[PDB]
Design a binder for these strands. Structure first.
Length: 228
RNA sequence: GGGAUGCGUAGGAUAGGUGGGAGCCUGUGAACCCCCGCCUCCGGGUGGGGGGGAGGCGCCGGUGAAAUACCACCCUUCCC
């Protein structure tokens, strides 16, 4: 068959014609999650934007009230006293020039990269073509560059997420784990949707949230009413 | 409503986009063989069937701008 027996059994638990409330979705995706790990819960939105024009990009960050439910390995690149600041703030790795070389030679065992602005000339130039095509190059709009590197690191450790519409006009994010209490998933979902609506482009035509689904890593989708 | 389609070069080879992913599939029948329709960039791909009877795939590494299982929302080019 096109799917395995685990997946096939899940399919009957979702009504394809029903649009669930967020509360119903939060409860349901915990029944759906069946893989042998703590499946990541996801939200997908089909946006009423024109992804061909830069003034209708939907890009941003948000801290979920209850975070991400996974460790985030953070690499910090810094100088001066920021180095030890990054360290005591709990960055998994902290370094300078030599850290840059290490990455530049193929080291990638980290989940996020953050930097002080006074290494970004070097990081940008040398690591741009390496971290770029993988969405890891630090950026102060994404809240990953700045001299308060302690706060950035903690913000990210505490699972602050990014969202960026794809070129087809859909957007996607992780919003929690299927092991979370349902009310805490609901909170994270509403928090993410609230952030998307905060970034609705001024000139976007039509309904902004054309479709919104909740799913988890390995299971079917649940279509939801974003305004519930 | 339903069904297909996604290949420069390098690379197992047919890598549409992004997000999730460290697991996934398998006597609820793996690999493999065989037949037919469709598609094809003529490499193969894809959907279904006739057999088979125990493992196959991913991750890591490698190539690459991008990495592959599995899952989600989409988009392209089409056809009932």
């Amino acid at each position: 068959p096109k799917h395995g027996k685990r997946y096939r059994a899940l399919l009957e638990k979702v009504d394809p014609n029903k649009i669930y409330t967020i509360d119903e979705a939060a409860h349901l995706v915990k029944e759906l999650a069946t893989a042998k790990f703590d499946e990541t819960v996801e939200v997908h939105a089909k946006l009423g934007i024109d992804p061909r024009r830069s003034d209708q990009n939907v890009r941003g960050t948000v801290s979920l009230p209850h975070g991400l439910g996974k460790q985030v390995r953070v690499l910090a690149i810094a100088k001066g006293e920021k180095i030890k600041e990054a360290e005591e703030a709990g960055a998994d790795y902290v370094g300078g020039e030599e850290i840059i070389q290490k990455i530049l030679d193929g080291w990638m065992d980290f989940d996020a990269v953050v930097a002080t602005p006074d290494v970004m000339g070097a990081v940008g130039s040398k690591l741009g073509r390496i971290l770029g095509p993988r969405g890891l190059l630090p950026n102060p709009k994404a809240g990953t560059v700045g001299f308060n590197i302690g706060e950035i690191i903690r913000e990210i450790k505490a699972g602050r997420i990014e969202f960026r519409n794809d070129k087809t006009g859909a957007i996607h994010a992780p919003v929690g784990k299927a092991s979370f209490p349902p009310e805490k998933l609901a909170d994270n979902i509403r928090a993410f949707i609230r952030a998307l609506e905060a970034h609705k482009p001024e000139g976007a035509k039509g309904t902004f949230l054309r479709s919104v689904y909740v799913t988890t890593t390995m299971v079917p989708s649940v279509r939801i009413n974003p305004h519930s």
